[PDB]
Ligand binder design. Structure first.
Ligand SMILES: O=C(Nc1cn[nH]c1-c1cc(Cl)ccc1OC(F)F)c1cnn2cccnc12
Length: 279
């Protein structure tokens, strides 16, 4: 079985990225021992979320799309997710160091690719729930792929109701996710608009969606922050236009943030939107 990897040949090279429960490392699957094996990205849990990883491994295994990271296999006894290695890392890490390389045309092409990969996920009846630049991987200067699926859940129904909301990226969530933990495909459209903002800002730390919202709502509200974040979304207040971003790209972003899940555009429609701007 080429999808079965033995632990003894999986040679850790370095750490790539880290979440709260999950960890991604660069490894070389080296059966020959001469350090000639292929490099792979390995997802393991930090030392119980074993059940969610197993489900995530099964979601990824059956996802086949050029804008979604390729599943390569597993490593058992207790499981590790084996995927292809994308050396340019995430958009969160890649964009600040490549401003000279990536221009608006390229940013909008990335925008399409994320949309396409997201629209394939939704058509397979899945909600992502963690769509941010940190979960988007860079293949090259021309191609991006959705790199993580840790929060991904199957919609039965227009939505799936979440029980555990503890590591939720609240500054990327739609008001229904914040108010009732209700996740629709439109919730992923809302998160796309936030991911779009990061992308057009080259993922700048000082103008991150969290920081732009803390300046909007007030940074000293502690545990009242989500309520006040919902308060400002209700008022009609949204993330500001990114510097040097044309108003029509900002208009496509504003359509991702229509308070009502039904008033929001679909990914198919966003694809058409950016395609008209690329001609
Ligand atoms: O560089 C990579 N990963 C990375 C960089 N920083 N943080 C992460 C990361 C961390 C976690 Cl816990 C989960 C997903 C992550 O990547 C994300 F961007 F999708 C990488 C490269 N190929 N590859 C394939 C699959 C997964 N990761 C990688």
């Amino acid at each position: 079985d080429p999808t079965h990897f033995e632990k003894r040949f999986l040679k850790r090279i370095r750490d790539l990225g880290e979440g709260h429960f999950g960890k991604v490392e660069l490894c070389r699957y080296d059966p020959e021992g001469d350090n000639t094996g292929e490099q792979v990205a390995v997802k393991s849990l930090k030392p119980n979320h074993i059940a969610d990883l197993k489900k995530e491994i099964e979601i990824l295994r059956n996802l086949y799309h050029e804008n979604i990271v390729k599943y390569k296999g597993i490593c058992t006894e207790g499981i590790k997710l084996i995927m292809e290695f994308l050396p340019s890392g995430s958009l969160k890490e890649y964009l600040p160091k490549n401003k000279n390389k990536i221009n608006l045309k390229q940013q909008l092409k990335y925008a399409v690719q994320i949309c396409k990969g997201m629209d394939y996920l939704g058509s397979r009846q899945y909600v992502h729930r963690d769509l941010a630049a940190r979960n988007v991987l860079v293949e090259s200067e021309h191609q991006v792929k959705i790199g993580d699926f840790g929060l991904t859940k199957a919609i039965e129904k227009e939505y799936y109701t979440v029980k555990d909301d503890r590591d939720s990226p609240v500054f990327w969530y739609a008001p229904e996710c914040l108010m009732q933990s209700k996740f629709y495909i439109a919730s992923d459209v809302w998160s796309f608009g936030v991911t779009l903002h990061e992308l057009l800002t080259y993922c700048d730390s000082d103008s991150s969606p969290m920081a732009l919202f803390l300046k909007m709502i007030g940074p000293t509200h502690g545990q009242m922050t989500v309520t006040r974040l919902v308060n400002t979304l209700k008022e009609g207040k949204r993330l500001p236009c990114p510097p040097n971003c044309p108003d029509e790209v900002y208009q496509l972003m504003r359509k991702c943030w229509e308070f009502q899940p039904s008033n929001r555009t679909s990914f198919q429609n966003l694809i058409e939107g950016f395609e008209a701007l690329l001609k």
